């Protein structure tokens, strides 16, 4: 399998508080977040979800990958911990919040468990088709799994979960199976606010990961890159 990350605070923002990271040396989890919160507030929280998802499954990944679902649970509450902490203790980050999403990979390597809070996205890519595997935390993405009709809305990217929650409610988490070629796309809504899913599908149609990845960012920036942008892409 062959990976590649990138962020990129976008041609408007004045600082990135996405973060990423890849397991570069098994290659058995990929994590992006999208921070927010004034007063440097946002680049912590999804700095700490970042590292306490990461420490989280390289400590307790050998004893619990049988129950991927506990695991991914566990380390999603641990980051939310974290950032609680510093919050109560951090008046001025007191609202600071952000997104993640998490593939695990199996010890095969043809199964990725999903797992998200918030509006960042994880996709699946297979020959020239692209799906959106994450349901967003949003109220305008709720509505439209109710009975209202979003892509233009003003709100649209208000978040309805966060991590940085005492009251955080929700972790979703579900398996995908895997066939050669597919690739997983996990990417802040940087992205997705300036690149529509048909033209995201183009870019991973990029034989070369490295090359696929740089392209999705900078086309975010040529149609605008009024956010940060983080991809992380994976080819199986
Ligand atoms: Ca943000
Ligand atoms: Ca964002
Ligand atoms: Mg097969
Ligand atoms: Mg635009």
């Not at 990976?3 to 041609?11: E, I, K, R, S």
């Not at 606010?193 to 991973?204: A, G, H, K, P, R």
Request: charged share 25%; aromatic share 6%.
């Amino acid at each position: 399998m062959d990976v590649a990350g990138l962020t990129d605070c976008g041609l408007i923002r004045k600082s990135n508080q996405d973060a990423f990271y890849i397991d570069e040396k098994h290659q058995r989890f990929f994590i992006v977040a999208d921070g927010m919160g004034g007063h440097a507030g946002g680049e912590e929280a999804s700095r700490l979800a970042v590292d306490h998802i990461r420490q989280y499954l390289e400590t307790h990944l050998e004893d619990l990958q049988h129950d991927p679902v506990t695991l991914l649970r566990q380390a999603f509450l641990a980051a939310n911990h974290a950032i609680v902490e510093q919050q109560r203790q951090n008046s001025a980050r007191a609202d600071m919040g952000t997104t993640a999403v998490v593939i695990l990979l199996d010890e095969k390597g043809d199964r990725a468990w999903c797992a998200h809070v918030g509006a960042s996205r994880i996709y699946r890519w297979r020959k020239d088709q692209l799906q959106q595997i994450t349901s967003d935390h949003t109220w305008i993405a709720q509505a439209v799994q109710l009975g209202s009709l979003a892509r233009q809305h003003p709100w649209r990217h208000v978040l309805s979960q966060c991590l940085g929650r005492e009251d955080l409610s929700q972790i979703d988490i579900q398996p995908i199976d895997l066939e050669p070629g597919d690739r997983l796309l996990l990417c802040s809504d940087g992205l997705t606010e300036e690149l529509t899913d048909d033209v995201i599908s183009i870019y991973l149609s990029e034989p070369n990961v490295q090359k696929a990845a740089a392209a999705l960012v900078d086309a975010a920036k040529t149609h605008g890159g009024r956010d940060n942008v983080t991809v992380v892409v994976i080819s199986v």
